[PDB]
Amino acid sequence: NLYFQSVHSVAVIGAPFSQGQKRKGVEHGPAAIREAGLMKRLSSLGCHLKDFGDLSFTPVPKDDLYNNLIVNPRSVGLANQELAEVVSRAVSDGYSCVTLGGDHSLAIGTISGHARCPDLCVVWVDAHADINTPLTTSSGNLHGQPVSFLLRELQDKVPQLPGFSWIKPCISSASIVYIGLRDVDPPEHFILKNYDIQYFSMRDIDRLGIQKVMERTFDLLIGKRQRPIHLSFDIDAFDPTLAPATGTPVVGGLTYREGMYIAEEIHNTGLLSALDLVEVNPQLATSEEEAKTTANLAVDVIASSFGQTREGGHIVYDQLPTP
Amino acid sequence: VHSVAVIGAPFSQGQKRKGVEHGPAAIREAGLMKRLSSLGCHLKDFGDLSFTPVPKDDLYNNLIVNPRSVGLANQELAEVVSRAVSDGYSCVTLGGDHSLAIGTISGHARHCPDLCVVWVDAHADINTPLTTSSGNLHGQPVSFLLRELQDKVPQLPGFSWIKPCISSASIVYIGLRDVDPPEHFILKNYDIQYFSMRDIDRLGIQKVMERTFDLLIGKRQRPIHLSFDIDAFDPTLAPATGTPVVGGLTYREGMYIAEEIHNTGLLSALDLVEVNPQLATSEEEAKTTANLAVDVIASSFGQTREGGHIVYDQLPTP
Amino acid sequence: VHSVAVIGAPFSQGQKRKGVEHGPAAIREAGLMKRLSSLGCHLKDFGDLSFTPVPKDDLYNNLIVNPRSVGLANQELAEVVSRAVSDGYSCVTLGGDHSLAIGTISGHARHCPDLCVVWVDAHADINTPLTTSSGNLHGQPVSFLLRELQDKVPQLPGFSWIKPCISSASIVYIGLRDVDPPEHFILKNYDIQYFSMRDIDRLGIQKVMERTFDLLIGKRQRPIHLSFDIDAFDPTLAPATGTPVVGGLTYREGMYIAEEIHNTGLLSALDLVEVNPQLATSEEEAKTTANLAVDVIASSFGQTREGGHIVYDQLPTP
Ligand SMILES: O=C(O)[C@H]1NCC[C@H]1CCCB(O)O
Ligand SMILES: O=C(O)[C@H]1NCC[C@H]1CCCB(O)O
Ligand SMILES: O=C(O)[C@H]1NCC[C@H]1CCCB(O)O
Ligand SMILES: [Mn+2]
Ligand SMILES: [Mn+2]
Ligand SMILES: [Mn+2]
Ligand SMILES: [Mn+2]
Ligand SMILES: [Mn+2]
Ligand SMILES: [Mn+2]
């Protein structure tokens, strides 16, 4: 195929982060997504690719927990500082930056790096708000706290963690919209309500339908002006029947069609600037078909964010051959 | 904060498949009381009722199955429900087959003259003892409760105590997909409002709930009796049930119904019926059905998809 | 009262996967006849047609597999279909692969030139013999039937009998999700209207049906040909099929399409294709697909999810 509806320049970074949580196996998410044919699929869409490979993270030897709860803070903070450098570089060179996870604490680095695009906005697709502060978290898992480090308005509620001094809150509460929420901790509900952070929970999707959810999301984020979009997509936003290979599955999620629709609409803006595809943990699948299904779904989301659609039309056909 | 009473009704004589009597045990083992406690409910457990058996109770008019046993168990259940409601509790009854709504609705109506009913089921359960083809009383409970059908209903043995207590405009069905021709005639003829799966496909569950409440509580506040048959859900989500019908409610739709019922602040009684764990092909399928039953009950008392049940007042500061 | 002719067309040569020839029997074993009878249909079963096997049938231009075999079997089928239509029967052809639509549509158009087609499938089946990569004729049936496409279709051995009968404005697709680049080109350049899965996600199935009928029968009433590929449904619902594609129609959406088709009173012929019981991983997976095939056909002839199929106008009195 020589003709395509659009030609995107895409950078791919593997970020096998696992220290943002306790379940082993999420470090294998990048290799699982790659094995599901990610690079071939993007090439088939006419993308110009730059593969940065899979990043290497050496854990800090004396990484003592913060306030007897926050686990691996120097390792998470430091690995995110290195990831932020790679993202800033890829975006600076003109690539839409795809980061494969790895747990969701990697968004601290991808969003910080990307903003180095200060007017970026974030579409956070997840069953979870990931907005616990280091003081509200009950698990001490940093994948449940990334948004707290990034939002300007929450700065006074967030203590300075070891290995996190480099972070400057980059997004305002009006510049992030959540889609898919269904497992929100009481302090997170408090934060979303009191800081007027807009979200479309599963109940909002049940009422509005995904078409109106995307229209409203774009009105909130890019209604006033064109802005680079950061799509942070947790695989657990999808129903566990569709995405079983993940750490914190919650029943009643997005259908395959709703998830593709989100990605298709993001592509249709022509503003996608960085994408995170996180929390694929092949080890938590009960079977190879369950693991492959989850990895295939991750590839479908990424492909749809760069032009794959249900009707085709991504690949341009010149003329029909005559007998 | 809600005052919630729980009654186990291990009864199976409203139908022919054995095992539905284990439904209350399955729901309790799925952690019902712990979940309601975690939502701040002031609870009262009445336990699992031991229904007085009727030894001689064979086929009536070569059609009606166990009329004496169904009539008696429902009379006994009506007494326990009446006790819970008069004591100020929102009454949760765990089934057991759906013939048990004869008892729960009769018991509730003894204290609520203006009660209304939301009947969530794949079936209308409105055959009269003359229209029924199976003779199974779980397919007939609404016929004994509806005032407008009194002249169409014969007096069955053990059913003399029942007083029709609901009018045709006071019951709304949600989830219908397997309706008998006489049931269809009854619904249309008597102007009984229903939202079948086809109506949900067209309108969406949000409009279905808005219209349901407009019909029932649009003019005035009334106590709500939610009669919820687990088979309203798609059999892939609720396989452990006697009469599964494909193309049912999704998990999201069922939670939405329960959340909207909670939001009225008028839920007065809830029945969670037809969970038959013995009909599941595996243990996990039985447990999935029981877990779904708990989610319906918890959502009916405040459990949400947005984390607003436990109120946080101040975030800790560094 | 609907007069319905059931034809078993055990086609398999339109594709490479074996087992799809056992599709008509799998649908019968799923109780198709018992179901259509219960709906008050006047039935004629032609049984399974025995097509003349072509021993010497080499590939056309080193790509098109079994051309003569597919072309001849469709010629025989078009005659049986033309005769069943002539006799006053609504023709239900059981598949078999989707290349059989060449035969069913051709036969139907001989007596119904103003027919319109509702093609329900994950695929547009509109590759020409020159655009196909697989050489499988089930991916090309619509190219041989479309009037506006005649100059781009070469004459294949055993395909000369086919006269392009359907125009581009007389076919509407529903369910599309796996469309090859030359197929997208064809749909867009020949103005063929379609409702992909993305259009369904936006509009909802009720609006999709309203718009489908607006396009086809907005100006006048016309005979309807419903060509239904079982793969239109999500593979979780219809796994026993050759080319499954994730994110398809739900059970509810598929029933709604069939109900709307029934509601026009204009249904003249129906194809139920691509059920392959051999591709199922278990016995229940094959049975599920066959049961789904029966529900589609039954709903196209009156089966409802509200029980309004049978005339009932008087309640029995005690
Ligand atoms: O704070 C926590 O540990 C918890 N809060 C909600 C669930 C869990 C976090 C899940 C992270 B993720 O989005 O997969
Ligand atoms: O009358 C009957 O036996 C039949 N009519 C419709 C289906 C069945 C009733 C099923 C009872 B239930 O709600 O599970
Ligand atoms: O041309 C081809 O072989 C391919 N194009 C699209 C997919 C396949 C056709 C599938 C036929 B069917 O509707 O089951
Ligand atoms: Mn997350
Ligand atoms: Mn999550
Ligand atoms: Mn019932
Ligand atoms: Mn039922
Ligand atoms: Mn087809
Ligand atoms: Mn197909």
Q: Which ligand minimizes its atom distance to the CA of A107?
A: 4
* Among B180, B186, B246, beta carbon nearest to C251: B246
* Among A133, A189, A206, beta carbon nearest to B308: A189
Reply yes or no: is the peptide bond before residue A102 cis, omega within 30 of 0.
yes
Residues 6+ apart with CB under 8 A from B117: B105, B166, B170, B171, B172, B224, B225, B226, B227
Query: Rounded to an integer, what distance in angstroms lies between the CA atom of residue A149 and that of residue A139?
Result: 17
Residues 6+ apart with CB under 8 A from B219: none
DSSP letter at C159 equals -
- Short-list C12, C16, C129, CA closest to C64: C129
- Short-list B311, B205, B268, CA closest to B5: B268
Buried b (16+ CB within 10 A) or exposed e, A189-205: bbbbeeeebbbbbbbbb
Query: Rounded to an integer, what distance in angstroms lies between the CA atom of residue C265 and that of residue B9?
Result: 48
Q: Which residue has the tokens 């129903």?
A: A239
| Cβ–Cβ < 8 Å for B22, B278 | yes
* Residues of B with Cβ-Cβ distance to C305 under 8 angstroms: 176-179, 196-198, 247
Residues 6+ apart with CB under 8 A from C238: C230, C231, C232, C244, C248, C275, C288, C289, C292
| Cβ–Cβ < 8 Å for C269, C225 | yes
- Short-list A115, A109, A123, CA closest to A55: A109
Q: Which residue has the tokens 């019922």?
A: B261
Neighbours of C196 (CB within 10 A): 23
| Cβ–Cβ < 8 Å for B36, B120 | no
Q: Is B193 exposed, middle or buried (0-12, 13-18, 19+ CB in 10 A)?
A: middle
* A239 counts as catalytic: no
* Among A187, A201, A252, beta carbon nearest to B306: A201
| Cβ–Cβ < 8 Å for B300, B261 | yes
Query: Rounded to an integer, what distance in angstroms lies between the CA atom of residue B59 and that of residue B136?
Result: 10
> Given in angstroms, what resolution was this structure solved at?
1.6
Cα separation of the two ends of chain C: 31
Q: Which residue has the tokens 């800033």?
A: A88
The bridge status of strand C267-273 relative to strand C90-94 is: parallel
Q: Which ligand minimizes its atom distance to the CA of A22?
A: 1
Which ligand 1 atom sits closest to the C-alpha of A140?
Answer: 3
Which tokens is B118 given? 């939301």
- Contact between chains at C206 and B204 (C-beta distance less than 8 A): no
Query: Rounded to an integer, what distance in angstroms lies between the CA atom of residue A61 and that of residue A311?
Result: 52
Q: Which residue of C has its CA nearest to B190?
A: C315
- Short-list C171, C282, C268, C176, CA closest to C225: C268
Q: How many CA atoms lie within 13 A of C296 on its CB side?
A: 32
A279 Rama class: left (phi>0) / alpha (psi -120 to 50) / beta: left
Q: How many CB pairs under 8 A join A and C?
A: 69
The bridge status of strand C90-94 relative to strand A176-179 is: unpaired
Reply yes or no: is the peptide bond before residue B96 cis, omega within 30 of 0.
yes
The set of chains that have 3 or more CB pairs under 8 A with B is A, C
* A236 counts as catalytic: yes
Tell me if residue C171 falls in helix, strand or coil: strand
Query: Rounded to an integer, what distance in angstroms lies between the CA atom of residue C49 and that of residue B166?
Result: 57
* Residues of A with Cβ-Cβ distance to C197 under 8 angstroms: 257, 310
| Cβ–Cβ < 8 Å for A224, A234 | no
* Residues of A with Cβ-Cβ distance to B317 under 8 angstroms: 135, 156-157
A312 Rama class: left (phi>0) / alpha (psi -120 to 50) / beta: left
Q: Which residue has the tokens 């993305």?
A: C198
B121 is in an annotated binding site: yes
Beta bridge partners of B117: B171, B225
Residues 6+ apart with CB under 8 A from A5: A307, A313, A314, A315, A316
Q: Which residue of C has its CA nearest to A212?
A: C202
Q: C308 to chain B nearest CA, in Å?
A: 6
Q: What is the DSSP code string of B236-278?
A: TT--SSSS--SS-B-HHHHHHHHHHHHHHT-EEEEEEE---GG
Query: Rounded to an integer, what distance in angstroms lies between the CA atom of residue A252 and that of residue A232?
Result: 20
- Short-list C107, C187, C184, CA closest to C146: C187
Residues 6+ apart with CB under 8 A from C124: C142, C173, C176, C179, C180, C183, C186, C187, C194
- Contact between chains at B307 and A184 (C-beta distance less than 8 A): yes
Query: Rounded to an integer, what distance in angstroms lies between the CA atom of residue C38 and that of residue C10?
Result: 26
Which ligand 1 atom sits closest to the C-alpha of A248?
Answer: 14
The backbone torsions φ and ψ at residue A40, rounded to the nearest 5 degrees and listed phi first, read -60, -40
Q: How far is the CA of A181 from the centre of ligand 7 (A)?
A: 31
Residues of C noted as catalytic: 98, 121, 123, 125, 138, 229, 231, 274
Alpha-carbon distances of B185 from A275, B127, B189, B265, rounded to whole Å: 56, 10, 6, 33
Q: How far is the CA of B124 from the centre of ligand 2 (A)?
A: 8
| Cβ–Cβ < 8 Å for C104, C226 | no
- Contact between chains at B252 and A202 (C-beta distance less than 8 A): yes
Query: Rounded to an integer, what distance in angstroms lies between the CA atom of residue C230 and that of residue C120?
Result: 8
- Residues with Cβ–ion distance below 5 A, ligand 4: A 104, 126, 128, 130, 234
| Cβ–Cβ < 8 Å for C267, C226 | yes
Q: C131 to chain A nearest CA, in Å?
A: 7
* Residues of C with Cβ-Cβ distance to A320 under 8 angstroms: 128, 130-131, 152, 182, 185-186
* A265 counts as catalytic: no
Residue of A27, A258, A276, A279 with catalytic role: A279
- Segment holding C5, helix H or strand E: strand C3-8
Which ligand 3 atom sits closest to the C-alpha of C135?
Answer: 3
- Short-list C302, C234, C242, CA closest to C270: C302
Alpha-carbon distances of B318 from A2, A71, A81, A190, C305, rounded to whole Å: 58, 18, 23, 17, 59
- Short-list C70, C98, C277, C187, CA closest to A311: C187
Q: Dihedral of the CA atoms C247, C250, C255, C258 (nearest 10)?
A: -10
Residues of B noted as catalytic: 98, 121, 123, 125, 138, 229, 231, 274
Q: Which residue has the tokens 């069922």?
A: B254
Tell me if residue C115 falls in helix, strand or coil: coil
Query: Rounded to an integer, what distance in angstroms lies between the CA atom of residue A131 and that of residue B75?
Result: 53
Optimal mutation site among C35, C315, C317, interface B, most CBs of chain B within 10 A: C315
Which tokens is B185 given? 């005639």
Q: Which residues line ligand 3 (CB under 6 A)?
A: C 98, 121, 123, 125, 127, 132, 134, 136, 138-139, 178, 180, 229, 231, 242-243, 274
Integer-rounded Cα Rg, in Å, for chain A is 19
User: Edge-to-edge strands of the sheet including C194-195?
Assistant: C42-48, C3-8, C90-94, C267-273, C224-229, C116-120, C171-174, C194-195
The experimental technique behind this entry is X-ray
| Cβ–Cβ < 8 Å for B54, B158 | yes
Q: How many CA atoms lie within 13 A of B85 on its CB side?
A: 27
Q: Dihedral of the CA atoms A249, A252, A253, A255 (nearest 10)?
A: 130
- Contact between chains at A136 and B252 (C-beta distance less than 8 A): no
* Residues of C with Cβ-Cβ distance to B202 under 8 angstroms: 204, 206
Which ligand 2 atom sits closest to the C-alpha of B241?
Answer: 14
Neighbours of B270 (CB within 10 A): 25
Angle at A260 (CA atoms; ends A259, A262), nearest 5 degrees: 65
Tell me if residue B136 falls in helix, strand or coil: coil
Query: Rounded to an integer, what distance in angstroms lies between the CA atom of residue C316 and that of residue B149?
Result: 11
Residue type, C169: A
Residue type, A123: V
- Contact between chains at B256 and A206 (C-beta distance less than 8 A): yes
Per-residue H/E/C for chain A? CCCECCCCEEEEEECCCCCCCCCCCHHHHHHHHHHCCHHHHHHHCCCEEEEEEECCCCCCCCCCCECCCECCHHHHHHHHHHHHHHHHHHHHCCCEEEEECCCHHHHHHHHHHHHCCCCCEEEEECCCCCCCCCCCCCCCCHHHCHHHHHEHHHHHHCCCCCCCCCCCCCECHHHEEEECCCCCCHHHHHHHHHCCCCEECHHHHHHHCHHHHHHHHHHHHHCCCCCCEEEEEEHHHECCCCCCCCCCCCCCCECHHHHHHHHHHHHHHCCEEEEEEECCCHHHCCCHHHHHHHHHHHHHHHHHHCCCCCCCCCECCCCCCCC
Residues 6+ apart with CB under 8 A from B108: B81, B82, B85, B91, B115, B223, B225, B268, B269
| Cβ–Cβ < 8 Å for C98, C14 | yes
Of how many residues is chain A composed? Answer: 323
| Cβ–Cβ < 8 Å for B228, B273 | yes
Alpha-carbon distances of B224 from A271, B92, B121, B166, B270, rounded to whole Å: 49, 12, 16, 12, 8
Atom 13 of ligand 1, nearest CA residue? A128
Ligand 1 pocket test, pick from A23, A70, A139 with the greatest ligand atom count within 8 Å of Cβ, gives A139
> Could you tell me the domains of chain B?
3-300 (3.40.800.10)
| Cβ–Cβ < 8 Å for A120, A146 | no
The backbone torsions φ and ψ at residue A18, rounded to the nearest 5 degrees and listed phi first, read -130, -15
| Cβ–Cβ < 8 Å for A132, A144 | yes
Neighbours of A287 (CB within 10 A): 10
Residue type, C251: Y
Query: Rounded to an integer, what distance in angstroms lies between the CA atom of residue A261 and that of residue A212?
Result: 11
- Short-list C103, C118, C88, C135, CA closest to C10: C103
| Cβ–Cβ < 8 Å for C89, C2 | no
Of how many residues is chain B composed? Answer: 318
Q: Which ligand minimizes its atom distance to the CA of C179?
A: 3
Q: How far is the CA of C17 from the centre of ligand 8 (A)?
A: 14
- Short-list B224, B239, B99, CA closest to B248: B239
Q: Which residue of B has its CA nearest to A190?
A: B312
